[PDB]
Amino acid sequence: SNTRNFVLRDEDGNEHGVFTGKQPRQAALKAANRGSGTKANPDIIRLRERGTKKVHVFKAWKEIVDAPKNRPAWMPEKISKPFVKKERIEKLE
Template identity: 65%
Template structure:
């Protein structure tokens, strides 16, 4: 599978950032880890907007983590809400 680009859109439809991933969920997790809650990702080259609800939670670092990793890390979580079709970009 090819790496795809997903443009992050705000509520007004402005594209405010680009996240990459093979699946929309992978890009959504990256956006959630930056602190975005209401995640609307438009796939580049299409008119599909994937909608996710995102959050990030503090968790203890996993077993076998390298020593330099802090004891608590942010872990992103996303839930897919649906897909919208745009009339025009």
């Protein structure tokens, strides 16, 4: 087992919080929570990976859609779906 953290950065060089996961799929998911505009509106952020020598940058957007179905009580109703658009993960060896 192994766990790589991620440090989300904004746009002006200022970084926000730090994630503690592993899979880029669910990591990029929470990155799109920027809230830039609404549905249609491009955005680009870069989370520095805290573990391996690699830069993480991807485009992502959110769409307000859904409704109270069978989601766990804490987070029901409707949520803006984030689109993990793999821009380019940099490499370093």
